[PDB]
A paper describes a structure:
Superposition of apo-Rv3094c structural homologs not only reveals strong structural conservation of overall topology, but confirms that the location of the FMN binding site, lying in the pocket between the β-sheet and the C-terminal domain, and stabilization of the flavin ring by hydrogen bonds are also conserved. Ethionamide is embedded within a hydrophobic pocket comprised of the β-barrel domain and the C-terminal helix domain and is surrounded by the hydrophobic side chains of W115, P117, P158, V202, F218, F352, Q353, and M375. To evaluate which amino acids are important in interactions between Rv3094c and FAD and/or ethionamide, we constructed mutants based on the structure of the Rv3094c-FMN-ETH complex. ETH-SO synthesis was markedly altered by mutation of either of the two residues involved in both the FAD and ethionamide pockets (F352 and W115) or those specific to the FAD (W80, S138, W174, L179, and H351) or ethionamide (P117 and V202) pockets, indicating that these residues are all important in FAD/ethionamide binding. Mutation of W115 and P117 to arginine (R) (changing the hydrophobic side chain into a hydrophilic side chain with an additional 3-carbon aliphatic straight chain) blocked ethionamide activation more notably than when these residues were mutated to alanine (A) (simply removing the large side chain). In the structure of p-Hydroxyphenylacetate (HPA) hydroxylase, a structural and functional homolog of Rv3094c, HPA passes through a gate formed by F266 to interact with FMNH-.
Numbering used by the authors: 7 to 376
Amino acid sequence: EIEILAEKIARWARARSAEIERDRRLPDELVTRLREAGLLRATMPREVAAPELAPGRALRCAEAVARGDASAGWCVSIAITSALLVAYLPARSREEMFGGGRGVAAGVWAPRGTARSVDGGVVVSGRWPFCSGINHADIMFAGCFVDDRQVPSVVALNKDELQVLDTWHTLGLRGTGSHDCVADDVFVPADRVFSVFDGPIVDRPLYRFPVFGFFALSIGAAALGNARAAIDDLVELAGGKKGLGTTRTLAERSATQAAAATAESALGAARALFYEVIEAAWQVSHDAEAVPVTMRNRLRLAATHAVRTSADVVRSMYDLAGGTAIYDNAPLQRRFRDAFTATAHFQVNEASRELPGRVLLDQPADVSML
Ligand SMILES: Cc1cc2nc3c(=O)[nH]c(=O)nc-3n(C[C@H](O)[C@@H](O)[C@H](O)COP(=O)(O)O)c2cc1C
Ligand SMILES: CCc1cc(C(=N)S)ccn1
């Protein structure tokens, strides 16, 4: 049923999409809707009054919201990924920050922070770009290195303690407000410092599902929903777009027909693989052993394929629309700008094909972050 709420919320995001972009943030009323549906805490554990939603359902919700507006969808993706880390907190700090239904999380994985140990915890400083959703998050999980360690850690920071810098001036995904955040000698109690590589404290199937795979897949979900919206925009425009020569509509051209078919099947294929691998990994997340590397590899293969295929689909629809889509009032223009902002994400760029290829070819590979 959360899926039905997500589709309703997608229609609200679509209605507000000009405001989202103009203000570089989600309207308060839209955040309230998302919160009341449980979408911004969907994957947090049941102990904090949260749905602990199965990953395929959560990702389908993000995809649905992104079809309404890619930035709104991306904020769901980042919220439901960051929410997983609530399962890595000791019970005391988990209750403090997320108990009784409280707390929305943001999260930047890049270990930009430097943390020094002190009596009771660490003192951390750093600057993190790409803090999606910080405008409506209470807590930001941030990567850092603690003293001498060569394996990075995560600190759970209150937004209160950070300086948010106005840096998010971007081609697309403007509504994500993915600004830089700065910590200046912030004290973090020891029980808000952890290592993802040590695994969750809440050891149930949702947190056995590959966490780095889920993050990648959440970007795929937003990209896929955006590409679906782009096809829908094209199809609506074509047929009515008549032009001024004595040929006729855009939809009546063979090239438009072949391109529509090519895009529809490419997107359908990417989406089908996406949900197939999620379900396969979800099944084995119920087993005693850690989800294996072969399965983790399939998730990363599918996430990157989804983002890259989505961009190819949106580029094709934009190109078909010709002089219509170059203007700021054209819906396809924002889809295009959003699709080509999403492609830059480090989990799903062209470079992200190389490690999953090494795994396929049985080559030596560091798979700690697969
Ligand atoms: C619109 C957008 C929002 C992003 N949000 C986050 C985030 O909240 N947390 C994170 O670890 N990465 C996030 N990323 C990943 C990086 O921002 C990605 O864009 C990066 O720029 C790729 O190169 P890099 O290695 O310099 O980070 C985001 C990326 C984009 C494009
Ligand atoms: C998601 C990629 C990544 C993860 C981490 C650790 N989880 S902190 C560090 C660097 N890069």
